[PDB]
């Protein structure tokens, strides 16, 4: 299963054991990895005209920055800052899915979970940000109590 | 044909509420700081550059405050505590006078001359702490 | 936009406005001129009309209006060969 996106196809019990493969290509190998973008800048300095392929490298950089920061912000509002599997205090509402653990973790892929739960994630994200905000308020005045 | 369902908290909805119950809605404004209406579901138009300039500005301002959180001891958090003691020449108000009575944007217009002095002391006690946490790991 | 733009009522806040120092007006004024000049730039330059225009008012129950505010004017235009002239009228 090792290799980028190689666990697509396996069930999500075994596809979640190798999450390091995805969170290294999407954190390291995006902006830090390439130094050849500044080898094409001097070749754009040789020609004195702004070309079509110089505009498309703006739009592929600003899409690359925003795609990186809009997944680290969302992991920053929650308590899951620098980790890959984190737990929350949000109880699972059975009207999101009534489906058992053995059907989910052992007979369903992640790509079949995208096409089931996607209408509900905007509601789920509200309840993770709200419970994280209630937690840090509670551990501040507890801290100030002693 | 649509219709308004149940309502929840919304963006800036706790502005002018108070100071202690507007800090229970910190994630609502912190969610709307990076992605706006610019992201939806042929080249070099006047409205094309003005949309692209709004996307480069929105990253520069976000990374500005996100840098400043990590220089402090407070990364990935919403409420953090420091070791800098509060100085009454910055503001002398009581504890039940800024909480439960004051709102933000009234406290903002009060200490906005002193924030550059406050920001320097948070950064200085973070250098002094991280050297000490290094020098505690030599035993 | 898949939702139409919305409006959240903010409670207990006051705010000073000033319609004579609002910069949304000066930003909108530079944009309406910018969009105006973008469109006229690929259109046709019309320097072959700087010539003389020899003409007499129009020819003709009766029409009896617009006789002193409108006239056909004939002139030597250019053709698509830059060697020939064409005798061309216009109101």
């Amino acid at each position: 299963l090792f290799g980028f996106l190689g666990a697509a196809g396996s069930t999500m019990g075994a596809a979640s054991l190798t999450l390091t493969v995805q969170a290294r290509q999407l954190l390291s190998g995006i902006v830090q990895q390439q130094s050849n973008l500044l080898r094409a800048i001097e070749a754009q300095q040789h020609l004195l005209r702004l070309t079509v392929w110089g505009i498309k490298q703006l739009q592929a950089r600003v899409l690359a920055v925003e795609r990186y920061l809009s997944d680290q912000q969302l992991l920053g509002i929650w308590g899951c800052s620098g980790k890959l599997i984190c737990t929350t205090n949000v109880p699972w509402n059975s009207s999101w899915s009534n489906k058992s653990q053995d059907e989910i973790w052992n007979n369903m892929t992640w790509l079949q979970w995208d096409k089931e739960i996607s209408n509900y994630t905007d509601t789920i994200y509200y309840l993770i940000e709200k419970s994280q905000n209630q937690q840090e308020v509670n551990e501040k005045d507890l801290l100030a109590l002693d | 044909a649509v219709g308004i369902g149940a309502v929840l908290f919304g963006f800036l909805g706790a502005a002018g509420s108070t100071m202690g119950a507007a800090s229970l809605t910190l994630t609502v404004q912190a969610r709307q700081l990076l992605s706006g209406i610019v992201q939806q579901q042929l080249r070099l138009t006047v409205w094309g550059i003005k949309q692209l300039q709004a996307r480069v500005l929105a990253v520069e301002r976000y990374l500005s405050d996100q840098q400043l959180l990590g220089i402090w001891g407070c990364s990935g958090k919403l409420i953090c505590t420091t070791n800098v003691p509060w100085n009454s020449s910055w503001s002398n108000k009581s504890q039940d006078e800024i909480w439960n009575n004051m709102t933000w944007l009234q406290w903002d217009k009060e200490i906005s001359n002193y924030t550059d002095t406050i920001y320097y002391l948070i950064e200085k006690s973070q250098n002094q702490q991280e050297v000490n946490e290094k020098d505690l790991l030599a035993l | 936009t898949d939702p139409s733009p919305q409006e959240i009522h903010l409670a207990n806040v006051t705010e000073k406005f000033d319609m004579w120092k609002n910069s949304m007006v000066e930003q909108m004024h530079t944009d309406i001129i910018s969009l105006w000049d973008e469109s006229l730039k690929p259109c046709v330059k019309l320097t072959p009309l700087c010539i003389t225009l020899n003409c007499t008012n129009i020819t003709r129950n009766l029409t009896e209006e617009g006789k002193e505010e409108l006239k056909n004017c004939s002139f030597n235009a250019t053709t698509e060969l830059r060697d020939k002239i064409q005798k061309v009228h216009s109101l």
Epitope: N119, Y120, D122, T123, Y126 | A1, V2, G3, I4, G5, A6, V7, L8, F9, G10, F11, G13, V28, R31, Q32 | T1, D2, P3, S4, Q6, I8
Partner: antibody, heavy 134, light 112 residues
């Protein structure tokens, strides 16, 4: 599919009725339902609309504050109440179903609201009538 | 939103195609990009019946003689080769905003 109605009859002005519209072999918690109204020798009107969530209901302007729409997702039924009946309501009341299921409420993050989605028709009911008389 | 139709009644010949148009005041293009125009059919003493549930696309179980067209506010419904199953009442319905109004209604007849 089959859409069955009942509960219609003859009353006085200033009374209360309870129409009903039982469905056959739906999920029925996915489909929001309607109520149209056809006077004799007239065109169709619109009366009310409940969602599959059974949370957000809307009424027409002329019938506001007088009617009451509910549903029971266990029994697969519609429950149209009426109150303070006028004279001009002598017509035929058909329940109806949207041609596709509206999904869940869609939370808008910027204002914190939930939104329901409404659309057209598949299946009008049989068509029951209420005639008010003296 | 109001609705008006032309005409109020047709008098046609079997085998000859005809058309019925609806007119809306406000444009019915939703924020989805898809419109909200609905074409119905009520036989006399009968339940109504959907025919075309957009500008264009046809209901599952309706013959291909009924074609729909239009955009904005101008819309039509062009019956191809009017037959004995194509008489009665034809309606327009919007679903852009509440209240969900119906059109006026035509009465398609032949010449006995």
């Amino acid at each position: 599919v089959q859409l069955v109605e009942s509960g219609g009859g003859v009353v006085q002005p200033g009374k209360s009725v309870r129409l009903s519209c039982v469905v056959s072999d739906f999920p029925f918690s996915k489909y929001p339902m309607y109520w149209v109204r056809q006077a004799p020798g007239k065109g169709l009107e619109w009366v009310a609309a409940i969602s599959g969530d059974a949370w957000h209901v809307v009424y027409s302007n002329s019938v506001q504050g007088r009617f009451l729409v509910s549903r029971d997702n266990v029994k697969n039924t519609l429950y149209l109440e009426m109150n303070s009946l006028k004279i001009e309501d002598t017509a035929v009341y058909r329940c109806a179903r949207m041609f596709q299921e509206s999904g869940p409420p869609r939370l808008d993050r910027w204002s914190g609201r939930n939104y329901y989605y409404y659309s057209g028709m598949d299946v009008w009911g049989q068509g029951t009538t209420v005639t008010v008389s003296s | 939103i109001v609705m008006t139709q032309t005409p109020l009644s047709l008098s046609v010949t079997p085998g000859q195609p005809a058309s019925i148009s609806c007119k809306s005041s406000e444009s019915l293009r939703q924020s989805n990009g898809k419109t909200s125009l609905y074409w119905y059919r009520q036989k006399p003493g009968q339940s109504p019946q959907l025919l075309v549930f957009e500008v264009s696309n046809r209901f599952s179980g309706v013959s291909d003689r009924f074609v729909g067209s239009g955009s904005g506010t101008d819309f039509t419904l062009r019956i191809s080769r009017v037959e004995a199953e194509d008489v009665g009442f034809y309606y327009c319905m919007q679903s852009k905003d509440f209240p969900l109004t119906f059109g006026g209604g035509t009465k398609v007849d032949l010449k006995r």
